[PDB]
């Protein structure tokens, strides 16, 4: 299966229990993508499988792309997964709406 | 102490970039709490202070509670579950508070 790239979306504001992470994310959220890769909606899609795949592929592709670099720390990996998951849910909402209203 | 305990919510399926954590969560999610503690709404309430208060109290309350038996993996899973459920709780309360 290939994957579509969604349109940019605004980067999620995310609040963390760790004061360090909470501030780090505010100051560094521009380091992460504002688009996700996803499998187009079909008869087999649901939020669980859509987001599962979107998260896996978006992170994997970003690593493949960022081997113009790029020095993601452990903290960046954690920040990256949280933001990607939220954006993938937003993408699911976009695609599923378009797919049923059609 | 001024905090409420929310009603049970369905446990979210939370996704991780790495295969190990992603599967671990599917297999173990039923072991984490499905209620969070929070400060009820207000003219001062927004996602920001609501979520931060919910996370701080709820993590706390599980320091007192659990302890039974949890690895660093479970602790990381639980922290993330709380951070995500607190957003869900915010959506529930902010909306109820506004439709009244």
Other beta carbons within 10 angstroms of residue A52's beta carbon come to 18
A38: helix, strand or coil: strand
CA distances, A57 to each of A35, A43, A47, B8, B61 (Å): 12, 20, 15, 32, 36
What's the CATH architecture for A1-102?
Answer: Orthogonal Bundle (1.10)
Other beta carbons within 10 angstroms of residue A96's beta carbon come to 15
Q: Report how far Cα B47 is from the mean position of its chain's Cα atoms.
A: 14
Measured between alpha carbons, how far is A86 from A91 in angstroms, rounded to an integer? 9
The residues pairing with A64 across neighbouring beta strands, listed in sequence order, are: none
User: Are the CB atoms for A32 and A80 separated by under 8 Å?
Assistant: yes
User: Are the CB atoms for B58 and B82 separated by under 8 Å?
Assistant: yes
CB atoms A17 and B48 under 8 Å: no
List the single residue in B17, B59, B79 with the smallest CB-CB distance to A55. Answer: B17
CA A77-B81-A70 angle, to 5 degrees, is 5
Q: At what angle do helices A19-28 and A74-101 cross, to 10 degrees?
A: 60
Measured between alpha carbons, how far is B39 from A74 in angstroms, rounded to an integer? 32
**Phi first, then psi: what are they for A7, rounded to 5°?**
-70, 155
Q: What share of chain A is helix, strand, coil (3-state, %, to 5)?
A: 60, 5, 35
CB atoms A15 and B48 under 8 Å: yes
CB atoms A17 and B55 under 8 Å: yes
List the single residue in A15, A80, A88 with the smallest CB-CB distance to B52. Answer: A15
Q: Which of B15, B16, B22, B36 to mutate to test the interface with A (most CBs of A within 10 A)?
A: B15
The structure tokens listed for B61 are 């309350």
Secondary structure element (H or E) that encloses residue A6, with its range: none
Best CA proximity match to A82, nearest among B15, B53, B36, B47: B15
Task: Report how many Cβ contacts below 8 Å link chain A to chain B.
Answer: 43
Measured between alpha carbons, how far is A70 from A66 in angstroms, rounded to an integer? 6
- Per DSSP, helices labelled H in B4-100 are 19-28, 47-64, 72-98
Is the minimum CB–CB distance between A80 and chain B shorter than 8 Å? yes
Query: Which CATH superfamily, name and number, covers B1-100?
Result: Prion/Doppel protein, beta-ribbon domain (1.10.790.10)
Q: Report, in angstroms and rounded to the nearest whole number, the Rg of chain A calculated over CA atoms.
A: 14
Measured between alpha carbons, how far is A21 from A23 in angstroms, rounded to an integer? 5
User: Are the CB atoms for A83 and A34 separated by under 8 Å?
Assistant: no
CA distances, A30 to each of A25, A33, B74 (Å): 9, 7, 29
**B70 contact partners, CB below 8 Å, separation of at least 6:** B78
List the single residue in B15, B56, B86 with the smallest CB-CB distance to A55. Answer: B15
CA distances, B83 to each of A38, A66, B43, B56 (Å): 25, 28, 23, 9
CA B28-B9-B81 angle, to 5 degrees, is 45
Resolution in A: 1.8
Q: What is the DSSP letter of B5?
A: E
CB atoms B82 and A16 under 8 Å: no
Q: What is the DSSP letter of A44?
A: T
User: Are the CB atoms for B25 and B16 separated by under 8 Å?
Assistant: yes
Measured between alpha carbons, how far is A36 from A4 in angstroms, rounded to an integer? 8
């Amino acid at each position: 299966g290939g994957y579509m790239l969604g349109s940019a979306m605004s980067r999620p504001i995310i609040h963390f229990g760790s004061d360090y992470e909470d501030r780090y994310y505010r100051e560094n959220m521009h380091r992460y993508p504002n688009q996700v890769y996803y499998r187009p909606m079909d008869e087999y899609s649901n939020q669980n499988n859509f987001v599962h795949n979107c998260v896996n592929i978006t992170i994997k592709q970003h690593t493949v792309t960022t081997t113009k670099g790029e020095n993601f720390t452990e903290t960046d990996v954690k920040m990256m997964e949280r933001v990607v998951e939220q954006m993938c849910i937003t993408q699911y909402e976009r695609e599923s709406q378009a797919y049923y209203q059609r």
